Design a protein around this ligand. Structure first.
Ligand code: DTP
Ligand code: DTP
Lengths: 229, 229
């Protein structure tokens, strides 16, 4: 059975970059894409923008769309490629779990989600993950960790309309969520599986985007981590 | 396998009354309750009221809560009672299907649901019903049919805070939806199963609430209908 892993991290920490690097280094590996272009244009309307401009009005709706999307991809069948490899690896950009423990949770804590919205959201989440338990399993998390300000810098370094308005405070919040869940284990979890899952912590405070030294150094840690799963 | 059926009809047409009558006449029969008391008090906040007072703001949220609820009950296992009967019957108050084809649909058509909300809702609905296809099956619909004004009268005859504000027009809309789906078959369906399902049409324009003649006359049609399933 393929090893399933999801990349977790803060906004702009450099996920897409880290993925391009993965794709290049381990081609057999299958990377399930993250729906960002499907959120800016719903097919008509930018949900992403809406969630950012009126968080108290569109946060819940957004979460329901992202959760469904993340759940769909995690339920899809393994490709034929992945099928025929000695050590198949499937990589997800963020997960069905971060949808809840990183964003939804945070959106509630900062007031963007009402008590009713948080309650309904959790009800849904716990219900479906229980029904689909046997199919959404993950073997480990690759946490691209970096400070809020570093992210804030990168966040602004790339235009991205929707985002230009994000304050440092917001990134600090999300940072907290990641640290509480993937590092300190202080976030109450509601899934026995999620309890003890391996977490590879990659420190990307220093722009690995260009230093070929650190890139080879990252892929190395990744390979070591994946193989011992 | 138990025969599964759902009671469909307009607001106040007299569903709860018709159910009390069923319970009394066919005790082996199992009637899965409809969550109305769980909507007026979420456990804190009245979603039902909210949806009515600010439809453009809470319709989508409401639909997601009612859909989940209706789906949950249709996935639950048959009770032990129902288990040991020669002809087991399971009755549902409205269904996972009316959630979409009666209310959600109508809420979109009358502007309470935006294009984005309608799209996300449908995406969810079609997805989960496809995943759970084999478990949500229904064998027939009992349509408690009556004119909008008759309903409007009954609607007002019973207090019900949340509702006091419903205009005749709204009931007319819902009436249309029922007629289009259960009678004229002019509502585009998205489930092969739902295509040709039996529909028992009970005319309840005349208050059967008290006339013991019509009650015995209704249960008779019901029994005849159920047995030939
Ligand atoms: N569950 C969520 N709830 C609310 N917003 C979310 C959620 N998940 C992602 N986002 C936001 C953060 C961003 O502004 C936009 C991010 O999409 P994405 O491109 O996947 O983020 P990112 O910041 O990790 O960049 P990238 O993956 O391109 O490197 O959507
Ligand atoms: N899917 C839905 N979307 C929006 N509102 C709904 C939906 N389903 C039911 N409702 C509303 C209509 C009512 O005002 C309240 C009705 O609940 P319910 O008691 O089941 O209705 P009813 O009008 O058929 O009466 P009863 O079953 O008590 O006879 O919730």
């Amino acid at each position: 059975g393929p090893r399933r892993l999801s990349i977790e991290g803060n906004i702009a920490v450099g996920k897409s970059t880290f993925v391009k690097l993965l794709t290049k280094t381990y081609p057999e590996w299958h990377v399930a894409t993250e729906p960002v272009a499907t959120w800016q244009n719903i097919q008509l309307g930018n949900l992403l923008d809406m969630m950012y401009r009126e968080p108290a009005r569109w946060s819940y709706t957004f979460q329901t769309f992202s959760f469904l999307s993340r759940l769909k991809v995690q339920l899809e069948p393994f490709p034929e490629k992945l099928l025929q490899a000695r050590k198949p690896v499937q990589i997800f950009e963020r997960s069905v779990y971060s949808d809840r423990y990183i964003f939804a949770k945070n959106l509630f804590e900062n007031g963007s989600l009402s008590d009713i919205e948080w309650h309904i959201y959790q009800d849904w989440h716990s219900f479906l993950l229980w029904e689909f338990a046997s199919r959404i399993t993950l073997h480990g998390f690759i946490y691209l960790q970096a400070s809020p300000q570093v992210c804030l810098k990168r966040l602004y370094q790339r235009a991205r309309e929707e985002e230009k308005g994000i304050e440092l405070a917001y990134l600090e919040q999300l940072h907290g969520q990641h640290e509480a869940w993937l590092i300190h284990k202080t976030t109450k979890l509601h899934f026995e599986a999620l309890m003890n899952i391996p977490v590879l912590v990659l420190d990307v405070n220093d722009d690995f985007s260009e230093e070929v030294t650190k890139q080879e150094d990252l892929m190395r840690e990744v390979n070591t981590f994946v193989k011992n799963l």
